[PDB]
Design a protein around this nucleic acid. Structure first.
Ligand SMILES: [Mg+2]
Ligand SMILES: [Mg+2]
Ligand SMILES: [Mg+2]
Ligand SMILES: [Mg+2]
Ligand SMILES: [Mg+2]
Ligand SMILES: [Mg+2]
Ligand SMILES: [Mg+2]
Ligand SMILES: [Mg+2]
Ligand SMILES: [Mg+2]
Ligand SMILES: [Mg+2]
Ligand SMILES: [Mg+2]
Ligand SMILES: [Mg+2]
Ligand SMILES: [Mg+2]
Ligand SMILES: [Mg+2]
Ligand SMILES: [Mg+2]
Ligand SMILES: [Mg+2]
Ligand SMILES: [Mg+2]
Ligand SMILES: [Mg+2]
Ligand SMILES: [Mg+2]
Ligand SMILES: [Mg+2]
Ligand SMILES: [Mg+2]
Ligand SMILES: [Mg+2]
Ligand SMILES: [Mg+2]
Ligand SMILES: [Mg+2]
Ligand SMILES: [Mg+2]
Ligand SMILES: [Mg+2]
Ligand SMILES: [Mg+2]
Ligand SMILES: [Mg+2]
Ligand SMILES: [Mg+2]
Ligand SMILES: [Mg+2]
Ligand SMILES: [Mg+2]
Ligand SMILES: [Mg+2]
Ligand SMILES: [Mg+2]
Ligand SMILES: [Mg+2]
Ligand SMILES: [Zn+2]
Ligand SMILES: [Zn+2]
Lengths: 128, 100, 97, 216, 25, 201, 91
RNA sequence: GGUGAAAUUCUUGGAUUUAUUGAAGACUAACUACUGCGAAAGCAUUUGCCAAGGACGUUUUCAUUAAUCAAGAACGAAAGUUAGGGGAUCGAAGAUGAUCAGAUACCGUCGUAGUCUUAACCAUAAACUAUGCCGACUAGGGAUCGGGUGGUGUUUUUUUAAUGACCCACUCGGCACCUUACGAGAAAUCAAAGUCUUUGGGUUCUGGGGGGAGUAUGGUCGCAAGGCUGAAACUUAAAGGAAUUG
C-alpha cells in the first residue's frame, strides 16, 4: 500500500479557512496556506472559493515534498466560540481528494469545553 | 453495623468499673487490676512511653485514643479532661474482646 | 393577559435553572427555555463522498459524523425561523414536525 | 528563499510490538549540524495513529493510540505507548437522551513505574419487554457501579506493566469484565475504557524499550 | 418615561435634597 | 527592632564536646523543645532547613541563601517566604519566586528553612498615632519624623522655594543624576496610581 | 450595664483618630488580647506577648505565631501544602 | 483578527496555524427531560466525614399536645458595601474604530470596578404560579417519580435462589400533562379561579377612581447605597381589565 502519510489539519472558521499539513507528528509542518492568501476581499477570506484555491497549493507542495497521503483533522473555532464548521471546510477537503492526494481517517477535532469560561457578549446578546 | 468507640466506653461507664488519670492508672497498672489503658492522643511522648513501659510489662492492652484529653473526658462522660483511662471491670461492654 | 400556560418553556416545580448562552447572538436564557436542535451531519457532506471514497485508501472505511446540539434564544430562533408563529390554537400542540 | 525542504532527512516510525503493523509512516527533521542534533528535534515527538492502522482491523475504527518516540537510530525511531483516546465522533454518538451517562476514572501506578489515569464510560439500556421510555438508573446504582468499575481498573492495572495493559486493551478484556460485574446491578449498555493518560514516566531504561522494540 | 428610570430620577432627587438639608445640619 | 520572633536553636559541636547555639528566625509553628534537623538528608517538616535541590516544586521556604553557605539572605521579614518553582539538574540550579514577585535562579545547594517567617500580620494594624511610630523607629534608626522637602528652603533641598509650596519641576529624577539631585521619585518608569493588580508576569 | 454599644476595647481611644481606624484596630486588638487553645497541653492558657510569640501559661510551651493571632491564615494553608508535598515523597 | 461591509489591532523580533511541556483562575458541557430535592432564595464531576429531610411501610408509642398568626426571629438571587486573598474569563466606568445629520449608543478593539474566595454588611427582584395557609366535598384519561402489596409474568447466571433489572394490577404521596364543563367567570380561562343572592368550616394578609407618590415629614435600621414605616395640599373624567371587528 505504501504512500507516505501526512496529516491535513483544516481549521475553517467563519472569517477564514486554514489548510495546514504536517507529518504524523504535528512538528515540522509541510504546507500551510489559508484563504485570505488567495483573494483580496477580507469578506471572502472564508469563502469556499479560497478554500479550494488554498488546497491546490498545499497538494502541489505535498507532491513537491513527496507526501502522497493525508489524514485530515477538521476543526471549528471551538472554546466558547461558534462550534459549527466553517464554510470553507468542505471545499478544502474536496480539493485535497480532488488533487490526487490519497485520503483517510477523518475526524472532527474542534475543541469543546467541559463548560468553562464565560462567553462573549454579555447576557443580553449581540443585538442588531 | 459498627459501634464506634465512645459508644463502647459509654457502657463501660455505667456498667463497668474504671479509673481515670495518670496517677491512679499506674497505681492500678502495678497491681494488675487493669485490662485496658486508653491514652489521649495529645499527652506527651514521655507519658505515653512511661505508660507504654508500664503496660507491655504488665501484659495490659493499650488503646491509643484518637483525640485530645478534652474529647477523651467527654467520651467517658465527664466535664473535666483526662489524658488516660484505665479499664478495671468490663461491664455489659465488650471492649476487651472486640477488634480494639 | 397570560399568553402561554407554560409562560416561557417548562419549569413547574423548580424555580431556578442555570441559563445557557445563545449560539447565534450569545444571549442568556434559562435552559428550561431556549429552543434546542440536534445537528448531525457527515464530515464530507454531499457531493464529496465520490471524490472522497475514490481518493481514499482503505476499502470502504466509513463517514464520521459531526454532532452538535444548538441552543437558540427566543429572538434568534424566531428570526432564523428555526421556529415560527402559529395560530392561537396551533400554538398548543407540542408535537414535533 | 532557501526552499528548506532540500535540507531535511527522513526517518521511518516504528510502533511497539504490542501491536500488529509496526511501520507507521515517516517524518522529516533538519540535517544534523554542528551544535544541532537531528535526534534532539526527533526525540520528544508524539504520533497519534488509529488502532485500526495498528491492528489492521476495522473493529478498532475509533480508539486512537498516541505513540511517543524515546530514541532514534539509523533512520529508524522507536516509539512507546503514550496514551489512548476515543475519537470525538465515536464518543458523541454513544451519548444519547433518555439514559444515564456514567463515567469513572482512577489513577494507579503499574508494575514498571508508570502513573496512569484511565477513564471508563457506560450507559444504561432498556431491555427486552420494557415499555417505559427512558431507563434511567437510581443514584444508588451509579454509586455502586462506579465503585465496581474503579475496583477493576485499579486491579487490572496494578499487577501489569505498560505492555500488559496495552495487550489487555486491544481485546477489550476490561469492557467484558466490567459488563460481567455490573449486570447484577443494572443493564448498562456499551462500556469502554475510553482514555488512558500518561502522568509520570519512570527513568529511561533503554532495556525495557529495546525488549519492546527490536526483537521480532 | 420608563418606570425604572423615573425611579432612578427620583432617587437622585432625594439624595440632593438630603445634601441640601444637610447644609443647615 | 525586628517584627517576627527569633528562636534559639541548640546544636552539638561535631568536632568537640560542647553545645553550639544558633540564632534562627522563628518559622511560625516552631516551638520550644521541638527538634530541628538540618541538611540535605533532613525530612520535609516545617522548621528544618534543607538544600533547595532537596525539596519538590511547590515547597515554601524562608531565609533562603543567595549563595550556598551565606547563612541566609532572601525572605527574612515577618510573614514572608519564597516558593520553589522548579529544578534544573544542569548545574545544580533551582529557580524560586521571591516575595517581591521576582523569579530568581540560585544553586540548589542553597539552604532554606521549611515554612514562613512567624509574626504574621503586623503591618495590618494601624499605627494609630505618632507616638506609636516614634517607639517604632526608636528601636530601629533615626529616620522619623520626616520633614517634606517642599517645606524647606531652596538651600535645604531641590523642592526648595516658595511663596507657594510646590515642586515646580518634574519630581522624577534621572537614574544617572548626581547625589543631591536625587529626591522624590527616582528611577521611576512610571507614576500615578496604577490599578494594574499583577505583581509578576 | 452593657456599657458601650460599638467600641468595646477601643473606648480607650475615645473620639480620636477616626472610627475606621478604631474599628480596624478593634479587630486585631481583641485577637492579640484573646486566650487560645494549646496544642500540647490541651487547655486554653495560651496568651501572646511580643507579637509573633505565643506561650502557654500552664505547660510553658512557646510557639512562633502570627502577629495578632496564634495561627496565620496563610500559614495553616502552608502547613497543609507541606504535609501534602511531604507525603508525596515518602509514599 | 474582526464584520453585513470596514476600521482600530497583531505581525519576517515569525503574527495566525502546528507540536511538546507547564502555570493561574473560573466553570462543571454532552447525559439534561414538561424528571428530582429544599420554606423560599436556590441546588448538577468523584470520593470521605458531619448532622438533617419527605414520602412510604407499621396490630409500636404519647394522647388533643393543634390550625392560622400583630409583635418578634432565621434564611434570603444579583448588584452593591468593609477588610484580606485571588484576579483566567467575561466585563458597568473610561478609552477607542466605525455607523450616523448628530451617535455620549446599538456593532468592533483595549479595559477599570466587578465577576471567585475568607470574615463582615446589605434585605431588595416580573423574589411569578403576578394565584396565603389548614380542613372537607364535587370528573373522566393516560404517562412519570418515591415507597409498599399482589404473579405456578418475562428476560439475568450454570438457570441457584437470590438480590437486580424489566412487565402487568393495585395503592398511598409527588412534579406535571390530556379531555370535559356539573359548576365558575367581564372574558381570557379555571379540576379550582367550583361546591356564593339557595350569600356563613377555621384563619393571616392586602385593595376602595386616576394623579400628585411611594413623594414630603417624623421614627427606625444601615458604614454607605439604601430598606421598613409613610402623609397632605392641589389636580383630574377618566385611567384601567378582557374580548371583537378594522
Ligand atoms: Mg481577514
Ligand atoms: Mg473583550
Ligand atoms: Mg460591548
Ligand atoms: Mg433581531
Ligand atoms: Mg402582548
Ligand atoms: Mg425565581
Ligand atoms: Mg529626627
Ligand atoms: Mg507620611
Ligand atoms: Mg512630612
Ligand atoms: Mg519654610
Ligand atoms: Mg537647588
Ligand atoms: Mg533641578
Ligand atoms: Mg519649591
Ligand atoms: Mg501646599
Ligand atoms: Mg504642594
Ligand atoms: Mg457600671
Ligand atoms: Mg460533566
Ligand atoms: Mg435525575
Ligand atoms: Mg449578593
Ligand atoms: Mg458581590
Ligand atoms: Mg476586595
Ligand atoms: Mg479582574
Ligand atoms: Mg464609552
Ligand atoms: Mg466606586
Ligand atoms: Mg384545600
Ligand atoms: Mg386523576
Ligand atoms: Mg417476579
Ligand atoms: Mg452471563
Ligand atoms: Mg415529585
Ligand atoms: Mg348544576
Ligand atoms: Mg378572581
Ligand atoms: Mg371609593
Ligand atoms: Mg386611589
Ligand atoms: Mg387618589
Ligand atoms: Zn439569540
Ligand atoms: Zn500547654
Amino acid at each position: 500500500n505504501s504512500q507516505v502519510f501526512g496529516v491535513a489539519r483544516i481549521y475553517a472558521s467563519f472569517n477564514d479557512t486554514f489548510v495546514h499539513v504536517t507529518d504524523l507528528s504535528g512538528k515540522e509542518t509541510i504546507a500551510r496556506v489559508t484563504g485570505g492568501m488567495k483573494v483580496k476581499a477580507d469578506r471572502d477570506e472564508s469563502s469556499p472559493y479560497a478554500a479550494m484555491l488554498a488546497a491546490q497549493d498545499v497538494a502541489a507542495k505535498c507532491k513537491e515534498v513527496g507526501i502522497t497521503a493525508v489524514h485530515v483533522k477538521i476543526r471549528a473555532t471551538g472554546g466558547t466560540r461558534t462550534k459549527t464548521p466553517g464554510p470553507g471546510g468542505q471545499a478544502a477537503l474536496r480539493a485535497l481528494a480532488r488533487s490526487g492526494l490519497r485520503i483517510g481517517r477523518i475526524e472532527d477535532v474542534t475543541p469543546v469545553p467541559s463548560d468553562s469560561t464565560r462567553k462573549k457578549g454579555g447576557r443580553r446578546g449581540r443585538r442588531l | 453495623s459498627q459501634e464506634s468507640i465512645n459508644q463502647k466506653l459509654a457502657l463501660v461507664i455505667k456498667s463497668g468499673k474504671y479509673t481515670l488519670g495518670y496517677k491512679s492508672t499506674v497505681k492500678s497498672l502495678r497491681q494488675g487490676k487493669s485490662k485496658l489503658i486508653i491514652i489521649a492522643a495529645n499527652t506527651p511522648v514521655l507519658r505515653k512511653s512511661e505508660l507504654e513501659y508500664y503496660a507491655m510489662l504488665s501484659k495490659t492492652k493499650v488503646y491509643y485514643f484518637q483525640g485530645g484529653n478534652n474529647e477523651l473526658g467527654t467520651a467517658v462522660g465527664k466535664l473535666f479532661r483526662v489524658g488516660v483511662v484505665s479499664i478495671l471491670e468490663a461491664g455489659d461492654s465488650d471492649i476487651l474482646t472486640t477488634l480494639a | 393577559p397570560k399568553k402561554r400556560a407554560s409562560n416561557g418553556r417548562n419549569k413547574k416545580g423548580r424555580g431556578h435553572v442555570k441559563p445557557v448562552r445563545c449560539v447565534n447572538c450569545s444571549k442568556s436564557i434559562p435552559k428550561d427555555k431556549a429552543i434546542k436542535r440536534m445537528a448531525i451531519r457527515n464530515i464530507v457532506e454531499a457531493a464529496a463522498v465520490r471524490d472522497l471514497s475514490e481518493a481514499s485508501v482503505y476499502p470502504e472505511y466509513a463517514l464520521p459524523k459531526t454532532y452538535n446540539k444548538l441552543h437558540y434564544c427566543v429572538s434568534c430562533a424566531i428570526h432564523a425561523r428555526i421556529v415560527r408563529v402559529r395560530s392561537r390554537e396551533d400554538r398548543k400542540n407540542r408535537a414535533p414536525p | 528563499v532557501v526552499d528548506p525542504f532540500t535540507r531535511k532527512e527522513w526517518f521511518d516510525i516504528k510502533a511497539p510490538s504490542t501491536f500488529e503493523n509496526r511501520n507507521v509512516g515517516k517524518t522529516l527533521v533538519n540535517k544534523s549540524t554542528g551544535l544541532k542534533s537531528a535526534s534532539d528535534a526527533l526525540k520528544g515527538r508524539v504520533v497519534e495513529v488509529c488502532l485500526a492502522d495498528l491492528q489492521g482491523s476495522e473493529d478498532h475504527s475509533f480508539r486512537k493510540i498516541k505513540l511517543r518516540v524515546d530514541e532514534v537510530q539509523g533512520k529508524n525511531l522507536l516509539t512507546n505507548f503514550h496514551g489512548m483516546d476515543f475519537t470525538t465522533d465515536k464518543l458523541r454518538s454513544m451519548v444519547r437522551k433518555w439514559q444515564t451517562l456514567i463515567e469513572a476514572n482512577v489513577t494507579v501506578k503499574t508494575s514498571d513505574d508508570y502513573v496512569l489515569r484511565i477513564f471508563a464510560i457506560a450507559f444504561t439500556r432498556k431491555q427486552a419487554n420494557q415499555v417505559k421510555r427512558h431507563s434511567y438508573a437510581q443514584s444508588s446504582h451509579i454509586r455502586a457501579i462506579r465503585k465496581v468499575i474503579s475496583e477493576i481498573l485499579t486491579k487490572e492495572v496494578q499487577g501489569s506493566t505498560l505492555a500488559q495493559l496495552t495487550s489487555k486493551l486491544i481485546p477489550e478484556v476490561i469492557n467484558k469484565e466490567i459488563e460481567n460485574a455490573t449486570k447484577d446491578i443494572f443493564p448498562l449498555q456499551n462500556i469502554h475504557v475510553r482514555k488512558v493518560k500518561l502522568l509520570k514516566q519512570p527513568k529511561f531504561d533503554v532495556g525495557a524499550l529495546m525488549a519492546l522494540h527490536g526483537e521480532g | 418615561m420608563r418606570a425604572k428610570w423615573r425611579k432612578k430620577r427620583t432617587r437622585r432627587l432625594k439624595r440632593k435634597r438630603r445634601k441640601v438639608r444637610a447644609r443647615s445640619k | 527592632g525586628r517584627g517576627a520572633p527569633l528562636a534559639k536553636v541548640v546544636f552539638r559541636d561535631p568536632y568537640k564536646y560542647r553545645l553550639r547555639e544558633e540564632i534562627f528566625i522563628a518559622n511560625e509553628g516552631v516551638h520550644t523543645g521541638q527538634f530541628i534537623y538540618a541538611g540535605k538528608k533532613a525530612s520535609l517538616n516545617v522548621g528544618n532547613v534543607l538544600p533547595l535541590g532537596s525539596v519538590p516544586e511547590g515547597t515554601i521556604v524562608s531565609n533562603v541563601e543567595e549563595k550556598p553557605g551565606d547563612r541566609g539572605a532572601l525572605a527574612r521579614a515577618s510573614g514572608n517566604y519564597v516558593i520553589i518553582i522548579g529544578h534544573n539538574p544542569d548545574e545544580n540550579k533551582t529557580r524560586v519566586r521571591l516575595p517581591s514577585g521576582a523569579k530568581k535562579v540560585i544553586s540548589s545547594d542553597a539552604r532554606g528553612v521549611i515554612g514562613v517567617i512567624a509574626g504574621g500580620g503586623r503591618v495590618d494594624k494601624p499605627l494609630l498615632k505618632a507616638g506609636r511610630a516614634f517607639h517604632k523607629y526608636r528601636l530601629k534608626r533615626n529616620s522619623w519624623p520626616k520633614t517634606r522637602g517642599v517645606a524647606m528652603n531652596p538651600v535645604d533641598h531641590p523642592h526648595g522655594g516658595g511663596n507657594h509650596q510646590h515642586i515646580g519641576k518634574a519630581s522624577t529624577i534621572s537614574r544617572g543624576a548626581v547625589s543631591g539631585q536625587k529626591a522624590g521619585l527616582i528611577a521611576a518608569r512610571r507614576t500615578g496610581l496604577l490599578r494594574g493588580s499583577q505583581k509578576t508576569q | 450595664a452593657k456599657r458601650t454599644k460599638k467600641v468595646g476595647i477601643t473606648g480607650k481611644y475615645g473620639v480620636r483618630y477616626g472610627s475606621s481606624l478604631r474599628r480596624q484596630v478593634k479587630k486585631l486588638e481583641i485577637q492579640q488580647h484573646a486566650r487560645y487553645d494549646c496544642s500540647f497541653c490541651g487547655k486554653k492558657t495560651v496568651k501572646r506577648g511580643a507579637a509573633g510569640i505565643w506561650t502557654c501559661s500552664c505547660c510553658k510551651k512557646t510557639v512562633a505565631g502570627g502577629a495578632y493571632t496564634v495561627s496565620t491564615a496563610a500559614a495553616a494553608t502552608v502547613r497543609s501544602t507541606i504535609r501534602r508535598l511531604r507525603e508525596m515523597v515518602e509514599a
